[PDB]
Symmetry: D2
Subunit: 125 residues, 4 copies
């Protein structure tokens, strides 16, 4: 089993009120759904990612990342977000991320194609 | 089938000489391997991602993203990179990305946990 | 005078314990010193930036940015950070930023030259 | 004088056709104007920044950064861009940057306040 397979698997919430439901596999896989509280989004979207299944034991966090393409049966916002970050275990477990949201654009608009931000996920709220 | 399922599936190379081997599924899935020409990496790593399987038809690119956790049977660099970008079809097909590489860190080093950069992938070289 | 010239001018502290001392000019100038609580830094460094001296009146924040080159009379870490963000006035005034720290590198190391993060500055602590 | 004071001072052009006019001071100051070929911009905008006036001599680039607030006598786009990067001297001198563009937003829109991209500046074109 991955060191934090148990710690990562479950439901997570970020500061925007979005919901991140993920299953961590023993091999390093992340699978689940994402529901955004903001933007051109409704209901759940497929996500997939990877995490370090054998992290350092020196108190470092666990690196991970995942992607959502913002197309589902209800909407298509022609964009994708990737979250890159680390899982920090303990009493107040957290997944601390920065993210890149890229929209499909024409080449003349490519310079404004990508948003960057940061989301913190907790097990509560 | 996804509009660019055929266009995305295959082998891609970036400006660093890294090799991105991907299969685009009809549902929006990305699966494959990544081989980095630089950094604490050797041989192939598992990747997974998502792409917009029904992009706009107005000449916009196709949004996509994917993740590599830098653990395989040879090495574990306790880090993960996510690439967020868009596929641009045509004679000179390109995948234009920006990426976030997060290392597992202690909390005292979390401020220096994340690199950002940009990779351009072409079908040749 | 700039709408938030008075609001921005003064001493600010971020979540790392760093100290941001700035004077906002009527023309949009930012001048001051930065003292980082972390990294290859000691004492104060010169900073300069710009802010929107006539922001929207619809409740939006005030865009601003500034740069520190990490050379002073004590140390030279051959790097520069730029903070890009917005000032949010009111009872709990905040400057919410994301930043890019670029080190001078050889071309072979340019892919790992740039860190990205996010700092929140408050008037207290 | 700053090692690359002479190398940096002058007119630079990026891949979008924007024009970056800068004077590097002996102390590490950057002063000049920026004219963007794209976006909500017309004519020249004030910029200010900092650079490492005593870079490493091992072939590394010279770290630097600068800010433009997008207000001038013609327009106010209530936003600011910071470019963070390094100057690389030689026959084909380059300033390689990544940038963060933050718009003033309401707090409910703060999650989509910041664009990220990358500009390469050359002495010609
Ligand atoms: O909303 C979406 C999908 C939802 C994205 C939710 C984000 S993921 C990061 C964050 N953490 C989270 O939990 N939730 C948010 N994808 C298109 C994102 C278009 N813009 C903003 C929204 C919008 C809605 C309607 C019309 C226009 N926009 C991006 C802003 C932009 C940038 C550049 C040029 C033009 N517009
Ligand atoms: O190399 C790795 C895995 C390979 C990553 C390859 C990158 S993905 C983006 C890009 N596109 C590509 O095709 N290839 C590169 N993961 C740890 C990344 C540690 N640092 C740099 C390398 C290193 C090797 C040995 C010892 C120390 N570092 C990141 C730099 C850093 C940042 C903050 C604090 C300390 N160090
Ligand atoms: O510390 C500095 C200057 C201090 C920077 C402080 C940052 S500004 C953003 C943030 N908000 C804040 O208030 N404070 C921090 N500039 C070189 C930054 C080298 N690395 C990390 C530190 C270090 C100290 C000694 C030896 C090696 N590093 C960056 C990590 C890295 C990235 C890629 C390859 C290798 N290393
Ligand atoms: O254009 C500007 C100022 C010009 C900025 C030029 C950029 S600096 C980085 C790059 N290198 C360069 O040489 N040139 C470009 N500042 C507002 C930037 C609003 N959006 C895009 C333009 C626009 C024009 C009219 C109406 C709406 N937008 C940013 C996209 C966005 C993001 C999030 C939510 C909504 N919109
Ligand atoms: Cu180890
Ligand atoms: Cu968009
Ligand atoms: Cu806009
Ligand atoms: Cu559509
Ligand atoms: Cu690292
Ligand atoms: Cu370092
Ligand atoms: Cu206005
Ligand atoms: Cu560095
Ligand atoms: Cu490293
Ligand atoms: Cu030195
Ligand atoms: Cu904007
Ligand atoms: Cu939008």
């Amino acid at each position: 089993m991955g060191r934090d397979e148990a710690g990562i698997t479950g439901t997570w919430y970020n500061q925007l009120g979005s919901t991140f439901i993920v299953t961590a596999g023993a091999d390093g896989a992340l699978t689940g759904t994402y529901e955004s509280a903001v933007g051109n989004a409704e209901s759940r979207y497929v996500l997939t990612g990877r995490y370090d299944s054998a992290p350092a034991t020196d108190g470092s966090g666990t690196a991970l990342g995942w992607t959502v393409a913002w197309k589902n049966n209800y909407r298509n916002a022609h964009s994708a977000t990737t979250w890159s970050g680390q899982y920090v275990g303990g009493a107040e477990a957290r997944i601390n991320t920065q993210w890149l949201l890229t929209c499909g654009t024409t080449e003349a608009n490519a310079w404004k194609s990508t948003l960057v931000g940061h989301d913190t996920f907790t097990k509560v709220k």
